Amino acid sequence: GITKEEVNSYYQKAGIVLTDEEVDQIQLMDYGLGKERKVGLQLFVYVNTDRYCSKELVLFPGQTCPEHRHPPVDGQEGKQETFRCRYGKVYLYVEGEKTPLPKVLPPQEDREHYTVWHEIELEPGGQYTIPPNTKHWFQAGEEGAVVTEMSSTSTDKHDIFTDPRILEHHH
Amino acid sequence: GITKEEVNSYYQKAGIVLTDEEVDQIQLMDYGLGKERKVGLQLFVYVNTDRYCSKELVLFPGQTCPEHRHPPVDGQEGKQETFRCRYGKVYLYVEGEKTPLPKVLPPQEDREHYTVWHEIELEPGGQYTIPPNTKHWFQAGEEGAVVTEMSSTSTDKHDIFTDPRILEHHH
Ligand SMILES: [As]
Ligand SMILES: [As]
Ligand SMILES: [Zn+2]
Ligand SMILES: [Zn+2]
């Protein structure tokens, strides 16, 4: 199974230093789907204030983060988040015109729970800003990925997942 | 003289990848003081939206960023900013009780224009959040430093420098 130490090995690939205490604060998400290396996300929250947040994400090789959106909370538009690939490769899919031939697909057994198909390919240095309240999902290439998130305040509990099988306590 | 390529060499020390286009967007600040390697700052802005901002800062060995504060703009408290050392060492001085014996001092010829003395020493992985509208300055150790800034929206032009000799067009 996935461990926090294994996630930290990817931070180290990217040259990103966490203290021992911080490694213990890494979050492992499997979304209750029982297939963590295929569908899951791992992250470390640097900071989350009433105005801004940053996280360092790790995806293992071929791992997919399932489709979700960040809805308005407290009268704003929803979380806007900027994703910057630090290591590896990530295929990000966002609302927009469907890419006719995508480079990767979500897991076949869950595919009906993915609805957006506009492809953004990110290698290290690549960056993209996902607009508030828009559906998105992403999958790492065969070396995995480390991705920085820079955003407005995060409230994971309000995130809305396309797959109805994914519950609030899963985020 | 300092060049953008030289600044990028420090990003590379920290494992941080910028594209060629991004290297060209690095900002070099000397604050009009004519001693860039002693008093100055270099940075790359990843993103700056109406809600959040992130920058990657470089300080050369022994270089000091002069004292300033981020005042309220638009009815909020002022920019709150989280500083995380990625490489090297930085000595950060913030409002608070004066550290009786600091590890470093600002340039002797400008020292009267530094007024806060509460010392925070950061090595890689170290992080500190500078509260809104509070004076702060910082200086790298003998290997220099790379420091990530994560903050609310940045508006450099409204920053207030303690040294009256530093002008608006210098930031
Ligand atoms: As997320
Ligand atoms: As700054
Ligand atoms: Zn998201
Ligand atoms: Zn500042």
Q: Structural domain boundaries of chain B?
A: 1-171
* d(CA B63, ligand 1 centre) in Å: 36
- Are A46 and B84 inside 8 Å of each other by CB? yes
CA angle B141, B146, B151 (to 5 degrees): 120
Closest CA to B27 of B69, B66, B63, B56: B56
Longest dimension (CA), chain B: 45
Residues contacting residue B39 through CB under 8 Å, at least 6 positions apart: B30, B31, B33, B63, B64, B65, B66, B107, B110
Q: Which two tokens stand for residue B2?
A: 């300092």
**From CA B60, how far away is CA B124, in angstroms rounded?**
15
Listed resolution, Å: 1.2
Interface check B47 vs A, CB under 8 A: yes
**A20: which residues sit within 8 A by CB, 6+ positions away?**
none
In whole angstroms, give the CA distance from residue A40 to residue A139.
10
**Which residues precede gaps in chain B, with C-N > 2.5 A?**
none
A153 contacts A49 by C-beta, under 8 angstroms: yes
Residues with Cβ within 8 Å of B123's Cβ and at least 6 positions away in sequence, in order, are B85, B88, B89
Residue recorded with tokens 């290290």 = A124
Experimental method: X-ray
Nearest chain A CA: its distance from B106 CA (Å): 28
Could you say which of 2.60.120.10, 3.40.50.1820, 3.40.630.30, 3.40.50.300 is the CATH number of the domain covering B1-171? 2.60.120.10
Select the residue from B49, B55, B87, B148 to test the A interface by mutation, using most A Cβ atoms within 10 A. Answer: B49
Judge whether B41 and B29 are in contact, CB under 8 Å. Answer: yes
Nearest in space to B66 (alpha carbons), one of B107, B127, B118, B97: B107
Radius of gyration of chain A (CA): 15
- Structure tokens given for B21: 């286009």
Query: Are the beta carbons of A51 and B80 separated by less than 8 Å?
Result: yes
Q: Which of A8, A12, A13, A17 to mutate to test the interface with B (most CBs of B within 10 A)?
A: A17
Tally of CA atoms within 13 A in the half-sphere of A140 that contains its CB: 26
- Is residue B76 exposed (0-12), middle (13-18) or buried (19+ Cβ within 10 Å)? middle
Torsion of CA B122, B127, B132, B136, to 10 degrees: 10
**B52/A47 CB distance under 8 A:** no
Distance CA B3, CA A158 (A): 45
For CA atoms A143, A83, B152, B40, give the dihedral sign: positive
- Spatial separation of the C-alpha atoms in residues A167 and A32, rounded to whole Å: 8
Amino acid present at A75? G
Q: Chain B window 3-22: which residues touch A at a Cβ cutoff of 8 Å?
A: 14-19, 22
